[PDB]
Amino acid sequence: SQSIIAYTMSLGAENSVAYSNNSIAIPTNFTISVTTEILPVSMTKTSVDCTMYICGDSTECSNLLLQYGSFCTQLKRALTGIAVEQDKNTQEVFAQV
Amino acid sequence: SECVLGQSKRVDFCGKGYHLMSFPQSAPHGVVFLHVTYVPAQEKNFTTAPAICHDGKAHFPREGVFVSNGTHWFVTQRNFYEPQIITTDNTFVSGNCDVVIGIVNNTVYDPLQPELDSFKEELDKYFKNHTSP
Amino acid sequence: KQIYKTPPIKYFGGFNFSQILPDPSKPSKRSFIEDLLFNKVTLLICAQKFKGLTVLPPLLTDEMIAQYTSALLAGTITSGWTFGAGAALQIPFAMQMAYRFNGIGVTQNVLYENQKLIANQFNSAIGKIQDSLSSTASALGKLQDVVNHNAQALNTLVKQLSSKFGAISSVLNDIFSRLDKVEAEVQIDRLITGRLQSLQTYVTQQLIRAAEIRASANLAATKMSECVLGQSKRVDFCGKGYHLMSFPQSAPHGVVFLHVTYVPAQEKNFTTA
Amino acid sequence: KIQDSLSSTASALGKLQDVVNHNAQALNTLVKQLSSKFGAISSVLNDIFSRLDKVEAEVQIDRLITGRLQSLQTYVTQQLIRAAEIRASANLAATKM
Amino acid sequence: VVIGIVNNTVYDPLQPELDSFKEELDKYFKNHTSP
Ligand SMILES: *[C@@H]1O[C@H](CO)[C@@H](O[C@@H]2O[C@H](CO)[C@@H](O[C@@H]3O[C@H](CO)[C@@H](O)[C@H](O)[C@@H]3O)[C@H](O)[C@H]2NC(C)=O)[C@H](O)[C@H]1NC(C)=O
Ligand SMILES: *[C@@H]1O[C@H](CO)[C@@H](O[C@@H]2O[C@H](CO)[C@@H](O[C@@H]3O[C@H](CO)[C@@H](O)[C@H](O)[C@@H]3O)[C@H](O)[C@H]2NC(C)=O)[C@H](O)[C@H]1NC(C)=O
Ligand SMILES: *[C@@H]1O[C@H](CO)[C@@H](O[C@@H]2O[C@H](CO)[C@@H](O)[C@H](O)[C@H]2NC(C)=O)[C@H](O)[C@H]1NC(C)=O
Ligand SMILES: *[C@@H]1O[C@H](CO)[C@@H](O[C@@H]2O[C@H](CO)[C@@H](O)[C@H](O)[C@H]2NC(C)=O)[C@H](O)[C@H]1NC(C)=O
Ligand SMILES: *[C@@H]1O[C@H](CO)[C@@H](O[C@@H]2O[C@H](CO)[C@@H](O)[C@H](O)[C@H]2NC(C)=O)[C@H](O)[C@H]1NC(C)=O
Ligand SMILES: *[C@@H]1O[C@H](CO)[C@@H](O)[C@H](O)[C@H]1NC(C)=O
Ligand SMILES: *[C@@H]1O[C@H](CO)[C@@H](O)[C@H](O)[C@H]1NC(C)=O
Ligand SMILES: *[C@@H]1O[C@H](CO)[C@@H](O)[C@H](O)[C@H]1NC(C)=O
Ligand SMILES: *[C@@H]1O[C@H](CO)[C@@H](O)[C@H](O)[C@H]1NC(C)=O
Numbered sequence: 001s002q003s004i005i006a007y008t009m010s011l012g013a014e015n016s017v018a019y020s021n022n023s024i025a026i027p028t029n030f031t032i033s034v035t036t037e038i039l040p041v042s043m044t045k046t047s048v049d050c051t052m053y054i055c056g057d058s059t060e061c062s063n064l065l066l067q068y069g070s071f072c073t074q075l076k077r078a079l080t081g082i083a084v085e086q087d088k089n090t091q092e093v094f095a096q097v
Numbered sequence: 098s099e100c101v102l103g104q105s106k107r108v109d110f111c112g113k114g115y116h117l118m119s120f121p122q123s124a125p126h127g128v129v130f131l132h133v134t135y136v137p138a139q140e141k142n143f144t145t146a147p148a149i150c151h152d153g154k155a156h157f158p159r160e161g162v163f164v165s166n167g168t169h170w171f172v173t174q175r176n177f178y179e180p181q182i183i184t185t186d187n188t189f190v191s192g193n194c195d196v197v198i199g200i201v202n203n204t205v206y207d208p209l210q211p212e213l214d215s216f217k218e219e220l221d222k223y224f225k226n227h228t229s230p
Numbered sequence: 231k232q233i234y235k236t237p238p239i240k241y242f243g244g245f246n247f248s249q250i251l252p253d254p255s256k257p258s259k260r261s262f263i264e265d266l267l268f269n270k271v272t273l274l275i276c277a278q279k280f281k282g283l284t285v286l287p288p289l290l291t292d293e294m295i296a297q298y299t300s301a302l303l304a305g306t307i308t309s310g311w312t313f314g315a316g317a318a319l320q321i322p323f324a325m326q327m328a329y330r331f332n333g334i335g336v337t338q339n340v341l342y343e344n345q346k347l348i349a350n351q352f353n354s355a356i357g358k359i360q361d362s363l364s365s366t367a368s369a370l371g372k373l374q375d376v377v378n379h380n381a382q383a384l385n386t387l388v389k390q391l392s393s394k395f396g397a398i399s400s401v402l403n404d405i406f407s408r409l410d411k412v413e414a415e416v417q418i419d420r421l422i423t424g425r426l427q428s429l430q431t432y433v434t435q436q437l438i439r440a441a442e443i444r445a446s447a448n449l450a451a452t453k454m455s456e457c458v459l460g461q462s463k464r465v466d467f468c469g470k471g472y473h474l475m476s477f478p479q480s481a482p483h484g485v486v487f488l489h490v491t492y493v494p495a496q497e498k499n500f501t502t503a
Numbered sequence: 504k505i506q507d508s509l510s511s512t513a514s515a516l517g518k519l520q521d522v523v524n525h526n527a528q529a530l531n532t533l534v535k536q537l538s539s540k541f542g543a544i545s546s547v548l549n550d551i552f553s554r555l556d557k558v559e560a561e562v563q564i565d566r567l568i569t570g571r572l573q574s575l576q577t578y579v580t581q582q583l584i585r586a587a588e589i590r591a592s593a594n595l596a597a598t599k600m
Numbered sequence: 601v602v603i604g605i606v607n608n609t610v611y612d613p614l615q616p617e618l619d620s621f622k623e624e625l626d627k628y629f630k631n632h633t634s635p
Contacts, residue, residue, distance in 0.1 A: 009294070011233055011294065011297060011298065012231050012232050012233055013231075013232055013233075014232065014233045014235070015232035015233065015234050015235075015318075016234065016235055016237075017234055017235075017237075017304075017305065017308045017309055017318055017320055018237070018320060019236070019237045019239075019307075019308035019320050020320065020322070021241075021243070021322045021323075021324075022144055022145060022146070022199075022322065023142055023143070023144060023145070023320060023322070024142065024143055024144070024145040024162065024164060024319075024320070024321055024322070024325075025140045025141065025142040025143070025319040025320055025321075026140065026141065026142075026143060026162075026164060026173060026177075026178045026319070027137035027138060027139065027140040027176060027177065027178065027316075027317070027319070028138070028139060028140065028141055028177075028178040029137070029138030029139050030135060030136065030137055030138050030176075030177065031135075031136045031137075031138045032117075032133065032134075032135060032136070033114070033133075033134055033136055034131055034132065034133050034134075035112050035113060035131075035132045035134060036129060036130070036131060036132075037112075037129065037130045037132065038124070038127060038128075038129050039127055039128055039129075039130075040126060040127040041126065041127050041128055042126055042127075043126060044126075064542065067539065067540045067541060067542055068539060068541060068542075068570075069536055069538075069539035069541075069574075070532065070535070070536070074532070074577075093128060094121075094123075094128075096098065096102070106463060107456060108311075108314060108315070108455060108456055108459055108460035109314060109455040109456070109459060109460075110455070110456075113315070114315045114316060115315055136315070136316045137312075137315075137316045137317060137319075140317055140319060142320070145322070145325065147324070147325055147328070147342060148342065155339075155342075157337075157338060157339050162325075189339075191337075191339035191343075192339070192343060196342075196343055197342045197343065198342070198345065199324070209617060220625065224628065227632075228632070396561070396565050420565070431576070434580065438583050438584075438587065441587065442587065442590075445591075503604060503605065503606040
């Protein structure tokens, strides 16, 4: 007795407010509720080797990788910027005292 | 900086409702907040008028809103039912009561009324205590 | 959470909301102001997308977004700002506005004593807005370059596949029927890597652009929480002046606010101690 | 006391300093990159054409054009990231003011 | 101690609440002392 059905979305239970020009509503009571909320603050740090990924354990590949210039220095420079930044994200949240 | 280290006036920022306070909790690669909020419970409707005229002059609530339950009027808090007797301490006067629309008629008893009904009657009792002989 | 609806009587103390409340005569339930907005932003070339460039439809249809906006405007004029923090509580409008004045630093005794003048002064202001929106073609510029940048970027993608990238020809079939297979694999690599780096570039630009719309959907979600569902104490956040209220309106790929603010008029010198 | 504190050390204006350094270090790497070979015979376009016949020289230069062109697309993409961070700090200085 | 203070008269609101009754209580004394 199970199947897959397709329908139309519902925006919520319809309500009507009895607006009038000499009527007010005052609450006679209150309640206290606790609500949770989750927020990411940092992600895993990472580092990558220039050559072992590309020319792993090959002597004839690493020498001709140098003809490509300072390419992987930029990768080391960029990934280090992210890594050192992740220490600031945690140092600005919890370290206010 | 705002929800934990203070109380926030920004609506719908530190929780769904009127904010009270919050508690941090650590978590892997993040933080978790525990917002404590105030939510109004059941309500009852009344009848309201924007100003009250007693001595030909309008009166407005210093803090609060005029309400009635059918017989006589009251002034209460905005977010919690606590009626109080109308008194010159609760109201301030601003002009006559013809320019305003929606004004209604009732009586305002000045806070010196107990300070006179217990004194003027006492003084009248004193006056009758000395005029008779 | 609930879809409120305004009562049949539309006498809100003198204020005239006919321009913003839904209009039943039109087939859609869109106000008068929303009609001018929807006729000022325009969304065979679309049939020249036989290369696989398609456009998916949004989940929320337009006629359902106009119902969210209707409930915002029908629960902010009867219940005031109490509906965003719990149970909606009705309140007369001429009396609710006395609370917005009380939050500025101006006692409530001035609104009643100038109710007729204020109502007319607000009525005329809403009328002038409708002509200003339709005055020039630069009014809706912010919502315009959003749709232009997302269609001008598609044309360059399509026109890019007429280039050769150093190959013999830009047409893929004629390369094979003219060269032996031993070295026809050299030319095609130049043509299959250029066509592939021209598509990786398109994705990367979308990741940048979607991060600047995400930064504006997080500001429209704050303007609606604070300016609309309450009164804001932040100076110069919900309009130039002392804030009073706001009214959302929908628009293609965006939202339009109508901030009502208080501004002091002529002054006079004085001597103080 | 504020006047002396600002002029006390060289790390006071650090936030405005790495902004101008990152925009001058990025240019130097762009200029220094065009001395690389990318696996070609030589790093100069003029001498490649004067040593190899036209049928073969079209292979080496394409290995050099596609490297210099890719090294310039990286520079633009990095600027798009940085311009989206200053835009996030010009929207905070416009709120502080 | 404050700089820029100026001279004027502050009218007691509680005084007419008794001055009008000094117009009454003392008048009653005047209405009772004479006979
Ligand atoms: C609307 O609210 C007013 C204010 O509370 C109500 O008037 C007050 O009602 C109470 C309780 O019924 C009265 O107390 C009783 O008064 C009688 C008078 O003889 C006394 O014998 C009892 O021992 C008790 O004290 C109170 O007097 C009355 N206020 C005045 C000025 O008389 C009113 O009943 C409410 N009406 C409705 C429809 O809810
Ligand atoms: C609230 O109380 C005030 C004063 O207690 C009421 O004002 C009074 O209204 C009556 C009308 O019922 C006025 O009587 C009028 O007298 C003139 C002659 O002066 C006559 O030509 C009219 O036909 C009418 O009979 C009375 O003058 C007026 N009092 C004052 C001081 O102006 C008011 O009506 C009450 N509000 C409500 C809603 O009942
Ligand atoms: C609220 O404003 C609207 C728009 O100005 C008013 O509708 C106009 O009414 C006049 C009077 O008959 C007509 O001449 C206009 O053609 C109407 N305009 C439109 C767009 O329909 C409306 O009457 C106002 N509300 C009240 C209660 O007067
Ligand atoms: C009256 O108010 C004006 C401001 O509107 C004060 O300043 C005068 O008006 C303008 C504004 O600076 C200047 O062109 C005049 O020269 C100003 N007057 C003087 C004397 O400088 C003005 O000072 C005020 N006067 C009094 C008596 O309060
Ligand atoms: C404001 O009023 C006070 C008292 O009413 C003045 O103080 C008096 O000043 C005179 C000099 O003009 C002295 O002779 C009195 O002894 C002072 N009175 C006391 C109690 O010390 C004061 O000078 C006035 N201020 C101005 C600016 O006129
Ligand atoms: C409330 O509105 C009705 C109909 O619009 C009107 O008859 C009545 O006079 C109004 N009440 C007040 C107090 O203005
Ligand atoms: C009335 O006056 C007499 C003195 O003449 C005094 O002893 C008595 O307490 C007074 N009574 C009252 C009720 O004040
Ligand atoms: C205002 O300044 C003038 C000159 O600077 C001075 O003479 C005057 O006393 C000052 N006013 C007050 C109230 O101190
Ligand atoms: C003065 O006293 C007499 C009684 O001795 C009284 O009748 C009269 O009303 C009093 N006058 C006033 C103005 O109270």
